[PDB]
């Protein structure tokens, strides 16, 4: 790599003012919440283009100078490494200034976006034009990116929650600087780019998700029509051990699609950590004991597990399924509550917002849980939607975090037939002993979950290799074959998903 | 290629009785319905393994002897080339003996299948075990394969109609003979292979659809729970020119998911061709005129367009949406009819069967339309679900087929935001002039649709290059890069989707 020559060429493409080339100038791309005891996850440079033509020039220069680019959209991957590259010596390719909304079709319920478009922008666009379409917001929201989240296959809480399922058409800058459009996009004068996902011949959009094979410059998305009627619900379960009964009750409702939105099943500990610090619940050096959790949860109108769903359509379509849903959840020991019961409950308000694709007051209390705070790593293993799987995963996760002196703070995102078990590893990152302990605990979570047949849907830069190691040796070798063929100079995001040149 | 050495080694793997190595032995793999005036689409051999270990040995031999393999599951790609390879000198890898149902999960609504599993087998398995799951049948059916059909991204007529969206997990024999499991399948002891589609890192399952990058040896599929209530409907439109009004009415019902199943919008000409020969409607050498079609259609309880949809769930969920659906379709000039009205109507019976995932009596009347019959090529361009697009596509298709002396016989498969415009080019293949004219007509359909920005979701072995040429040069070159890196010896299905070593 010839860094000085690459950065000088970059200034010629975007201007000196959008190239950041020394320790001091790249401070804005350098903060992470993941454990980094060796301080190895840090960029050496940032370049901020406003056009796809600039992106294509940047990629040609990157090849010529063998200078790797770590590409981000808005770079708000909080708990997954923010804008920190997976390996040393990378320049962040920050696409935040490519923030053009390119198309929105009210009739077909579609849009086409540059990567820099924020949830806030797209919400504002729809409201300002009176377009009765909804977005699907992965908790974070405001200055996060539909494009960046969809490319890391993130999740929101409407019927359109599984973001990658609703992506339709993308444009990619390939490692050699050529643009390719997927699906129907490469047909001159096509009006079906956001209409038909697959195109003809191999389906390649997936290659550009959680990967380093290309730079996405445009992406299409399907958007849900605003329903006549929106009815949010909260189910309260009293006991830490109700986990399997909740999964077993929700699964038939989801498999049969009586409930269509991805459901957050929130632990009392996680909910409390949103608005309270740990030392408001229990003293430092005391465990987060069941009795203290139950008391604090109860005083805040929360159970030990709080599961959020919604019904969408007419008063008549809602009336069609609400009785069966209530009877199933009640039989599981759940108390089903509506907005009228949950007035002024901030958790209900948080979920009520998310399940209509609303944006919440951008405020992340989890970062202040323990001591000086500032430590967050998502450990996000998959499970089949089986109560015994949730039961066993919760039990192993609790044993491992408690062994390292950390708390179990978790939610299940319930899908159709699967579950994202989201485990927030919360620590004091400012205390270098605690950062080291959180690193060791995270390694033990990954290793011991993998030995039971469980592994991550998504991970942070500090664990991408160890999570890749849970999956097959053939998978790893095949992704290396693709990398070497697609990006011969190894200049796109080396070590993303454990994929190294 | 060393054909004799390969075929001798293949006998060692599967036994002499499952290797077919000369003109007369390969006749069962050589019949096609597509136009082939040069008789160029024909295998030189066939091999029929019963195990994935046999497949791996066959692929190792193929690489050693440089002998290409054209892989098929059941090989019933009727109107898309059956088991004919896209290029000369290929041995069919016929996987029909790998017909094991590996898993069926009643609770999660999943299965795992070998490629030879037929629709009939899976239906029988579900009924024999009293498992209240449905399958989703692409018209064809009985002896077709859920695996083969999903790998070519075909379509059925339940809410699970878009087969590739419901695939979850696969095992592939890569060109070097190594097995690789996608999604969660490469995690030893994973119970989530059929639960979570994406896995971790680049999503690769699309690479093995409409492609020659791998041999699929196992595939997971999601299956729809049998609903309490199934209510099939037929909408009858009176005029050939109602096309745009039908699409414009269905689109909001589909975009808002009031109607969740892929809807077949059938031309009177196609319906008549299912049960009648052309010379029962008009004399040979007379055009298939609007008056004659209308008369024959009306005599059979059909309109000029007949659109099929179903409602699934309870009496209450059905009652929730049926009024809005009726009002919308009636306002478009459609007459909405139920089973009670359409008693003994064989078209209603045909669609009523499809839309509950039933299998029809395996009888393909389309193959006897004109003269000696035997000529069928699907021309299957995509459209955005816009009335004006259907209007313009129908108009150009009719002008081109009519200019070559053929009829417009077509259906639209209505999807969420897309249409599959399925044009059946019916011809007398036994008349070598008529086969030549159908070849020329087919070339004119692809080239002139492509000039208007329209191209195929799927195409027969005779047109795979001309359809690839409609899509981008960067797409073509990128698929060649992947082919060369994934299959260095070019031994899997050369020319599939226009992809050549
Ligand atoms: C309290 C809290 C709650 C959260 N809740 C959720 C949640 O419910 N669901 C969820 O999904 N996430 C959640 N997150 C995680 C995270 O904040 C979001 O997923 C966020 O949307 C990701 O940041 P982003 O949108 O800026 O994407 P980016 O950081 O811009 O993109 C993420 C990654 O995608 C790739 N990438 C991005 N753009 C491109 C491009 N143009 N071409 C190629 N590769 C590219 C890169 O690998 C990049 O690191 C949460 C985080 C916190 C702290
Ligand atoms: C009247 C009529 C109506 C039809 N209606 C429909 C319809 O509604 N919907 C529809 O989708 N089709 C329809 N078809 C087309 C066709 O009959 C079906 O799509 C059928 O399911 C395909 O044949 P098959 O299942 O045997 O798959 P195969 O022919 O076995 O597979 C198709 C292709 O997939 C690939 N392939 C298959 N197995 C593998 C493997 N294991 N590894 C790698 N590649 C593999 C090969 O390219 C192969 O040619 C219709 C045909 C007719 C004549
Ligand atoms: C379902 O995905 C996620 C959810 C959250 C918080 O609910 C954090 C990270 C994720 O990846
Ligand atoms: C939706 O796909 C298809 C449908 C049909 C129905 O005649 C035939 C071939 C196809 O590919």
Numbering used by the authors:
A (entry chain A), B (entry chain B): 43 to 543
Published text:
Enzymes of the vanillyl alcohol oxidase/p-cresol methyl hydroxylase (VAO/PCMH) superfamily are found across all kingdoms where they perform a range of metabolic functions. These flavoproteins share a conserved FAD-binding domain and a more variable substrate-binding domain that enables interactions with a range of substrates. One of these, the 4-phenol oxidases/dehydrogenases, catalyzes the oxidation of para-substituted phenolic compounds. A fundamental distinction is that the oxidases efficiently react with oxygen producing hydrogen peroxide whereas the dehydrogenases hardly react with oxygen and typically employ other proteins, such as cytochrome c, as acceptors.
The sequence and phylogenetic analysis additionally outlined a peculiar enzyme from Novosphingobium sp. that belongs to the EUGH clade and distinguishes itself for lacking a flavin-linking residue and the presence of a valine in the N5-interacting site. Thus, it represents an unusual family member that naturally binds the flavin non-covalently. The enzyme from Novosphingobium sp. was of particular interest because it was predicted to lack a covalent flavin and to feature an unusual Val/Thr pair around the flavin N5 site, beside sharing 43% and 36% sequence identity with VAD and VAO, respectively. The protein was expressed in high yields in E. coli and is thermally stable, with a melting temperature of 67 °C. Although it belongs to the EUGH clade, the enzyme is poorly active on eugenol whereas it converts vanillyl alcohol, with a kcat of 0.29 s-1. Moreover, its activity does not increase with the use of bovine heart cytochrome c as an artificial electron acceptor. The enzyme was therefore named as nsVAO, although we cannot exclude that it might use an endogenous cytochrome rather than oxygen as physiological substrate. The protein exhibits a narrow tunnel leading of the flavin re side where Val181, homologous to Pro151 of VAD, is in direct contact with the N5 atom. The ability of nsVAO to use oxygen as electron acceptor thereby aligns with the oxidase activity observed for the P151V mutant of VAD.
